[PDB]
């Protein structure tokens, strides 16, 4: 839990600072192809957080 | 499991409670029930720094996982069949665990039906 | 529904005074005028090495910084801890007491050389 | 003070769209229902009975309170936002510079000289601006807190120092 | 452009 | 002890005859020098206390408390040359005269080898103090405060005097040693109960006491800053020091006739701590905070447990050093804002960075987080109380709640938050203020390395 | 419609849907107008002293000193012994003290009742 | 966060007023009074600010919202709140 | 750079999903007054958003590509064994 | 203004990325057996670790 | 102060990316999927199951050692 849960934060921190310190989920979207590394990092943490196999 | 449904939602009198059994004698209905065996004396299992909760009959298959793992260091993927060997006997004695659970259950049904049958017969 | 002429002129005057106030909130290129400082007489070697900062120079230049940091924060601390442990902490009894070294059947104990006899034959049941 | 009836309608409409934005989230639906929200506004505009309007405001905001988002959207730099005065820690009053050591003051020569110009100018204009304030007080005390602008020429707006010299919203 | 920063006296 | 008592007196002729402006400087340096001499008493044998002579003797309880007094004298002297330098030399010299005399009585009181000898100067500390609050105080209610303080402690001192002389007429000398070795089990007769009250109420009225704590808000808040430390740092320990010294001829009557006092103190500290959570005056919040900690000391003595006394001495000296430092904190604002309302001067961390830090670890030390001896003080009492009764922890720990909320609440309200807009008098902290406060907290942290000295006679 | 909002002291009724402001009378019209007037007098005079470039002290706030005086000093001289104060003082006073006395004595008597014939286990309890 | 001058301001402002199809895309005077010139309504005048509020990402107080009546006043107010001076 | 503002006369409502709102309000009678404001949010490079699953299956193409080479390497190595 | 090209952001997240992918595989295979992993156990609560998250 | 960063802000248009930040994202998304079923093919009993679970009705009365109901 230490690995991915900490990870999910600065990835969200990456989104927050870049998109003018806004934390409301209502104000992002389309960051998949706009923020590739963070999007990959977020979904990796999300899959790890779900106990998805062999991770 | 269907056992809980048959107990709480069914005839709880015919369901063996885990805390209650073993109630009937070992050889009751078993001509010459054979005792379990322990290849490893408690001296080496105590020596092997093995946890008491792990200090079961199948622990005899466990005492060499740590030995080979220590010898296999740093290669952590060496012992695969050997580790598989231990969890198999884990399965075997685990398999023994619900068969005897059902054995006492079947004895419970057999005794209950017998008593009711003879009660109306007498 | 509506800057009234009085308040509109008020905001007009107050704006430009604030604009000029911020127009005085900067600093000159000379600013800050820093007083002279004394330097440790070893920076000359690195800064001269840093004059070009070539790939043949920067990695080696950073090596000294990484090396001195390694000695100061690892070598010196580990020495004093080991000296503290070896001759002061371990001098008193039962201050470094460790778990008994786990051994298994079929292993020779070092200080006695005795091989513990192999555990008796396994039932040999696999999958 | 007096909040006129058409003003409250404007405030309610503004808060309605903000809440509707929080509910709709997506832009196309946000523009969809806001137009529907707009459509159900302009048709009740030509009523000659003010009793209808205030009665209309009654259940309308009663609808607003029921339908308000439990987690409405606020920009961070607004009351309740995630950056509400989060930069207030860094800001420092300007008068604290008077306590600086002369070595520190001399280390910013030109700016502190300009500070002296501001101080002297404020000192001179203070008498003029207070005289203007007392010369045009509404009878029976100040009726409103609104400040009067600088009337004559070569003067400064009365009561200007703190607002003009307020610390910036980005102090660092 | 960088501008003045207002900080309390620290030399003391 | 003569190596300390005579030098302490010797400052008085010196200060009264020093130069016009050399009064503070000369007095401070020898006052620090005397505290250095008083450091000699920290050594205590594993057995009977150091008995220098029939006139004076020091134990493992008096010596840690004695050094606190001697170390304190520089701190009021260094905390007072800002609010008194505008007065004439003679009055300033008279201020040193009171402070030096106040110390001398404390030194002799803590080291008295005779119980009645203890009683005179322990009571005689009133005269130098009463002058300080009433003369140099800075508010109108200081006069009623002086009457409140003087009469409230005198109402208990006299019954002690009648009790002590009665023990003389029945058991001979009241020497602390011969009293300890010649002990008679106190019967449950009604007279012995009233004798128990007389020998106890004088000391118990002195710390605070819930019901008898009304003089602290009057005295401490209205007292001058140099005095205000003393009414909370050391004289509260006089009421303390008496307790462990006198509770050796009252056993076992203290075993039974202690529930009303134990019950008053345990529930009382929760009440008075809750006062701090909803106070308006900075000094009053500090003074009421001292009530809760001191009430914890009152609880500690009345079980007569080795662990209880063991943390009792540590708590007193740890609390005394802290309460003085917090009273320094109130003074620092008091010079600038010229008022004691808390919400008047919020936002000091932005203006005064280091003074905010000095307010920081002072608050944590009052928070009694480990390893600060405030924690080692309270935590030891918790175990002693817990062994006495398991329900105590419910009342014990609930105090740790309130002492956590108001301690940071005083911090958060003053230091953090937006600075007050209309103030423009706060200047950089004088090096006197910062240096004084470092001399408070630093030995307090330095004591954490070896609290074996401060533990007390039971250790 | 739909359920409305019922208020409480801790959860006050929002001062926007309160019927009081929605209906308006001429008496209320100057009532709020004079709220601005008295507030303007307080604000302008404070700002006048605030913006004074020679005021190097503290602008004293009468509301603060009155609040401190009323909350601290001007209370007992206005205290009058009346039933509700009398029982409240007795309840929040000796009440918890005697209540704590009972349970703690109950703990103490039960505790020493256990050990006097040996109904407790403290074989390793030595640092009491 | 790169800084911003008032030149970038009315480039963003005049853009957003040009966004209003009710507004003529070529009658954007810097002091185009919304009522006298564009002939909108106060409700539509209200509609401007939250469009501006999302454009610059910040709240405009409602009391100052109706007080803004021209593109210049909007430009002036946004410059003051963000302490824009060049 | 001076942050060159894109010209207005390129962002419209057609093609973007906002257009479905348009004729729906046309039947209502009210015309969309600010469709072009959100036109960029649905047009330009920010359109063609990947479906939800495709986010999870990101890199699957190269993943399965690395599978066969690794598995085939093991298969021959096990065949040698 | 969205951007993550800062090396500090990239390297910090990447370290936790490569950590999260393996982490458990290394640790679980490496730490000695300390409990008794149950083996005999029916399918329909074996799969439920992943069934429940599929919905 | 001075700008000139490697990026530049855009107005309502897609911001510029870089060659590194895409493939770095592509690489780790690729090897995680690599790691997903590669461990599955090398180890399936962990997720699927290691031994079958015997059925209660199936085990015989005799091997259960229940005394016959008739006597
Ligand atoms: C060998 C020696 C090496 C150098 C030791 C230096 C000191 C040290 O760190 O000792 C560690 C030792 C540790 O003991 P130890 O048992 O680990 O042994 C040390 C030796 N070695 C490391 C080799 C094992 O502890 C002490 O000596 C205690 C120091 C306590 C210091 C307290 C200072 C208080 C100052 C108060 C000032 C104010 C007074 C007035 C007010 C009083 C309150 C009211
Ligand atoms: C999403 C949240 C939950 C969901 C709920 C969101 C909120 C729903 C609010 C519903 C409002 C309701 O229909 C009407 C009412 O309350 S009151 C009557 C309005 N009409 C008048 O009072 C007539 C006089 N007219 C004027 O005052 C001006 O014409 C006006 C200001 C209107 C426009 O001025 P123009 O722009 O210059």
From TrEMBL, chain B:
Q: Where in the cell is it found?
A: Mitochondrion inner membrane; Mitochondrion intermembrane space
Q: List the disulfide bonds.
A: 58-89, 68-79
Q: Name one GO molecular function term.
A: NADH dehydrogenase (ubiquinone) activity
* General function of this protein: Accessory subunit of the mitochondrial membrane respiratory chain NADH dehydrogenase (Complex I), that is believed not to be involved in catalysis. Complex I functions in the transfer of electrons from NADH to the respiratory chain. The immediate electron acceptor for the enzyme is believed to be ubiquinone.
Pfam families hit by this protein: NDUF_B7
Q: Which key words tag this protein in UniProt?
A: Disulfide bond, Electron transport, Membrane, Mitochondrion, Mitochondrion inner membrane, Respiratory chain, Transport, Ubiquinone
> Which family would the database say this protein is a member of?
Belongs to the complex I NDUFB7 subunit family.
State the name under which the record lists this protein: NADH dehydrogenase [ubiquinone] 1 beta subcomplex subunit 7
Q: Does the keyword Nucleotide-binding apply?
A: no
Q: Which GO terms describe its cellular component?
A: mitochondrial inner membrane; mitochondrial intermembrane space; respiratory chain complex I
Its record classes its membrane topology as: Peripheral membrane protein
Q: Which InterPro entries match?
A: NDUB7
Automatic annotation (TrEMBL), chain D:
Annotated spans, Disordered: 129-158
Specify first residue, last residue and whole-protein length for the fragment. 50 to 221 of 221
Q: How does it sit in the membrane?
A: Peripheral membrane protein
Protein's name according to its UniProt entry: NADH dehydrogenase [ubiquinone] 1 beta subcomplex subunit 9
Alphabetically ordered keywords of this record = Acetylation, Electron transport, Membrane, Mitochondrion, Mitochondrion inner membrane, Phosphoprotein, Respiratory chain, Transport
Q: What is the lineage of its organism?
A: Eukaryota, Metazoa, Chordata, Craniata, Vertebrata
What GO CC annotations are associated with the protein?
mitochondrial inner membrane; respiratory chain complex I
Q: Which gene encodes it?
A: NDUFB9
The Complex 1 LYR protein domain covers which part of the protein? Answer: 7-65
Q: Which organism is it from?
A: Sus scrofa (Pig)
Q: How does it assemble?
A: Mammalian complex I is composed of 45 different subunits.
UniProtKB/TrEMBL annotation, chain E:
Q: Which compartments is it annotated to reside in?
A: Mitochondrion inner membrane
Query: What protein family does this chain belong to?
Result: Belongs to the complex I NDUFB5 subunit family.
Q: What does the record note on quaternary structure? A: Complex I is composed of 45 different subunits.
| Functional description taken from the UniProt entry | Accessory subunit of the mitochondrial membrane respiratory chain NADH dehydrogenase (Complex I), that is believed not to be involved in catalysis. Complex I functions in the transfer of electrons from NADH to the respiratory chain. The immediate electron acceptor for the enzyme is believed to be ubiquinone.
- Name of this protein: NADH dehydrogenase [ubiquinone] 1 beta subcomplex subunit 5, mitochondrial
Q: Which gene encodes it?
A: NDUFB5
TrEMBL record, chain H:
Localization, UniProt:
Mitochondrion
| GO cellular component terms given for this protein | mitochondrial membrane; respiratory chain complex I
- List this protein's GO terms for biological process: fatty acid biosynthetic process
Recorded superkingdom: Eukaryota
* Residues annotated as domain Carrier: 7-82
Please tell me whether the keyword Transport is annotated for this protein.
yes
Q: Which keywords belong to this entry?
A: Electron transport, Fatty acid biosynthesis, Fatty acid metabolism, Lipid biosynthesis, Lipid metabolism, Mitochondrion, Phosphopantetheine, Phosphoprotein, Respiratory chain, Transit peptide, Transport
Write out the function statement from the record. Carrier of the growing fatty acid chain in fatty acid biosynthesis.
Q: Write out the similarity annotation.
A: Belongs to the acyl carrier protein (ACP) family.
Instruction: Name it.
Output: Acyl carrier protein
What is the source species?
A: Sus scrofa
């Amino acid at each position: 839990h230490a690995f991915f849960k900490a990870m999910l934060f600065m990835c969200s921190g990456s989104i927050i600072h870049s998109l003018n310190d806004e934390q409301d989920i209502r104000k992002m979207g389309g960051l998949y192809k706009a923020m590739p590394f963070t999007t990959t990092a977020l979904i990796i943490g999300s899959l790890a957080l779900t106990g998805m196999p062999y991770l | 499991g269907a056992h809980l449904a048959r107990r709480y939602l069914g005839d709880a009198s015919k369901e063996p409670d885990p805390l209650r059994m073993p109630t009937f004698p070992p050889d009751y209905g078993f001509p010459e029930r054979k005792e379990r065996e322990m290849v490893a004396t408690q001296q080496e299992m105590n020596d092997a720094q093995l946890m008491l909760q792990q200090r079961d009959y199948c622990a005899h298959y466990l005492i060499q996982l740590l030995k080979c793992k220590r010898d296999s260091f740093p290669n952590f993927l060496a012992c695969k069949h050997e580790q598989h060997d231990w969890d198999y006997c884990e399965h075997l004695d685990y398999v023994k665990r619900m068969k005897e659970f059902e054995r006492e259950r079947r004895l419970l049904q057999r005794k209950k039906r017998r008593e009711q049958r003879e009660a109306e017969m007498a | 529904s509506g800057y009234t002429p009085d308040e509109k002129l008020r905001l007009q005057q107050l704006r430009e005074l604030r604009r000029r106030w911020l127009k005085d909130q900067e600093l000159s290129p000379r600013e800050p005028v820093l007083p002279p400082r004394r330097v440790w007489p070893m920076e000359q070697f690195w800064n001269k090495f840093l004059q070009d900062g070539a790939p043949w120079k920067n990695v080696i230049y950073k090596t000294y910084r990484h090396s001195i940091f390694a000695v100061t924060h690892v070598l010196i601390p580990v020495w004093i801890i080991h000296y503290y442990l070896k001759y002061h902490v371990t001098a008193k009894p039962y201050t470094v007491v460790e778990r008994k070294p786990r051994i298994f059947p079929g292993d020779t104990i070092l200080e006695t050389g005795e091989v513990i006899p192999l555990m008796k034959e396994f039932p040999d049941q696999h999958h | 003070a007096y909040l006129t009836h058409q003003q409250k309608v404007l405030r309610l409409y503004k808060r309605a769209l903000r809440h509707l934005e929080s509910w709709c989230v997506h832009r196309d639906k946000y523009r969809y229902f806001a137009c529907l929200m707009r459509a159900r506004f302009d048709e009740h505009k030509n009523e000659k009975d003010m009793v209808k309007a205030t009665q209309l405001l009654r259940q309308a905001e009663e609808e607003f309170w029921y339908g308000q988002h439990p987690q409405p959207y606020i920009f961070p730099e607004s009351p309740g936002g995630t950056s509400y005065e989060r930069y207030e820690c860094y800001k420092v009053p300007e008068w604290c510079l008077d306590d600086w050591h002369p070595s520190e003051k001399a280390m910013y020569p030109d700016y502190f000289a300009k500070r002296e110009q501001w101080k002297r100018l404020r000192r001179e204009s203070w008498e003029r601006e207070v005289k203007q304030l007392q010369e045009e007080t509404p009878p029976g005390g100040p009726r409103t807190e609104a400040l009067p602008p600088a009337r004559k020429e070569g003067d400064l707006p009365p009561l200007w120092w703190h607002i003009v010299t307020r610390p910036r919203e980005r102090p660092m | 452009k960088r501008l003045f920063i207002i900080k309390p006296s620290g030399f003391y | 002890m003569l190596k300390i008592i005579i030098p302490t007196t010797m400052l008085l002729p010196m200060t009264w005859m020093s130069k016009h402006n050399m009064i503070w400087i000369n007095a401070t340096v020898h006052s620090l020098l005397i505290s250095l001499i008083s450091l000699s008493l920290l050594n205590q044998l594993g057995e009977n206390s150091l008995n220098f002579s029939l006139t004076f003797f020091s134990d493992s309880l008096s010596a840690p408390l004695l050094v606190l007094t001697t170390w304190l004298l520089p701190l009021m002297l260094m905390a007072s040359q800002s609010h008194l330098s505008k007065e004439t030399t003679t009055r300033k010299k008279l201020y040193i005269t009171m402070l030096i005399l106040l110390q001398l009585f404390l030194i002799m009181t803590f080291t008295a080898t005779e119980l009645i000898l203890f009683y005179i100067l322990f009571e005689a500390t009133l005269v130098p103090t009463l002058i300080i609050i009433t003369r140099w105080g800075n508010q109108t209610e200081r006069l009623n405060a002086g009457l409140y303080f003087l009469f409230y402690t005198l109402a208990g001192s006299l019954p002690l005097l009648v009790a002590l002389v009665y023990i003389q007429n029945t058991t001979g000398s009241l020497n602390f040693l011969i009293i300890h070795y010649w002990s008679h089990p106190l019967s449950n007769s009604w007279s012995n109960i009233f004798m128990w009250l007389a020998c106890i109420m004088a000391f118990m009225v002195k710390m605070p006491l819930y019901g008898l704590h009304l003089w602290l808000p009057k005295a401490h808040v209205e007292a001058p800053i140099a005095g205000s430390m003393v009414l909370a740092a050391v004289l509260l320990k006089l009421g303390g020091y008496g307790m462990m010294r006198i509770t050796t001829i009252l056993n076992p009557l203290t075993n039974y006739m202690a529930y009303p006092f134990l019950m008053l103190s345990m529930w009382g500290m929760i009440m008075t701590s809750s006062i701090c959570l909803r106070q308006t005056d900075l000094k009053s919040l500090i003074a009421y905070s001292s009530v809760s900690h001191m009430a914890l000391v009152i609880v500690a003595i009345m079980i007569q447990t080795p662990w209880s006394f063991m943390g009792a001495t540590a708590l007193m000296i740890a609390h005394g050093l802290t309460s003085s430092m917090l009273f320094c904190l109130a003074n620092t604002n008091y010079e600038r804002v010229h008022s004691r309302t808390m919400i008047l001067a919020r936002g000091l961390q932005t203006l005064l960075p280091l003074m905010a830090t000095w307010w920081l670890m002072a608050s944590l030390t009052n928070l009694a987080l480990p390893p600060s001896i405030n924690l080692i003080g309270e935590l030891f009492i918790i175990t002693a109380s817990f062994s006495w009764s398991n329900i105590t922890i419910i009342l014990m720990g609930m105090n740790m709640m309130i002492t956590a909320l108001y301690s940071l609440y005083m911090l958060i309200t003053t230091q953090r938050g937006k600075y007050t807009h209309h103030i423009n008098n706060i200047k950089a902290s004088f090096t006197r203020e910062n240096a004084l406060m470092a001399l408070h907290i630093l030995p307090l942290l330095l004591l954490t390395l070896n609290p074996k000295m401060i533990l007390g006679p039971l250790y | 419609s739909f359920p409305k909002y019922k208020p409480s002291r801790l959860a006050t009724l929002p001062a926007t849907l309160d019927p009081a402001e929605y209906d308006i009378s001429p008496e209320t019209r100057k009532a709020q107008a004079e709220r601005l007037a008295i507030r303007s007098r307080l604000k302008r005079e404070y700002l006048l002293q605030y913006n004074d470039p020679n005021r190097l002290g503290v602008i004293e706030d009468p509301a603060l000193i009155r609040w401190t005086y009323a909350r601290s000093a001007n209370i007992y001289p206005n205290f009058r012994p009346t039933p509700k104060t009398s029982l409240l003082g007795a309840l929040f006073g000796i009440g918890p003290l005697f209540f704590w006395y009972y349970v703690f004595k109950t703990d103490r008597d039960k505790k020493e009742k256990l050990i006097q014939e040996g109904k407790l286990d403290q074989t390793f309890n030595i640092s009491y | 966060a790169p800084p911003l001058t008032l030149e970038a301001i009315k480039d963003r402002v005049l853009y957003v007023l040009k966004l209003y199809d009710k507004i003529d895309p070529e009658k954007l005077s810097v002091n185009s009074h919304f009522m006298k010139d564009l002939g909108l309504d106060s409700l539509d005048q209200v509609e401007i600010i939250m469009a501006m509020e999302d454009e610059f990402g910040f709240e405009i107080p409602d009391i100052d919202a109706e007080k803004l009546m021209c593109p210049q006043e909007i430009v002036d107010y946004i410059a003051d709140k963000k302490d824009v001076y060049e | 750079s001076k942050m060159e503002l894109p010209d207005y006369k390129q962002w419209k409502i057609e093609g973007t999903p906002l257009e479905t709102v348009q004729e729906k309000l046309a039947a209502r009678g009210l015309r969309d007054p600010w469709g072009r404001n959100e036109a960029w949010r649905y047009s330009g490079g920010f359109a063609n958003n990947v479906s939800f699953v495709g986010a999870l299956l990101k890199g699957f193409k190269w993943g399965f590509a690395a599978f066969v080479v690794a598995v085939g390497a093991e298969y021959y190595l096990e065949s040698q064994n | 203004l969205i951007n993550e090209n800062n090396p500090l952001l990239i390297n910090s997240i990447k370290r936790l990325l490569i950590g999260s992918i393996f982490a458990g595989f290394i640790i679980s295979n490496n730490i000695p057996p300390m409990t008794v992993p149950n083996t005999t156990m029916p399918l329909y609560m074996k799969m439920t670790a992943l069934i429940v998250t599929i919905m | 102060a001075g700008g000139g960063v490697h990026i530049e802000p855009r107005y309502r248009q897609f911001p510029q990316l870089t060659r590194s930040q895409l493939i770095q994202a592509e690489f780790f998304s690729a090897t995680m999927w690599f790691w997903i079923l590669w461990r599955f093919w090398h180890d399936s009993d962990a997720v699927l199951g290691h031994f079958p679970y015997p059925d209660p009705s199936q085990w015989t009365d005799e091997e259960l050692g229940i005394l016959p109901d008739d006597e």
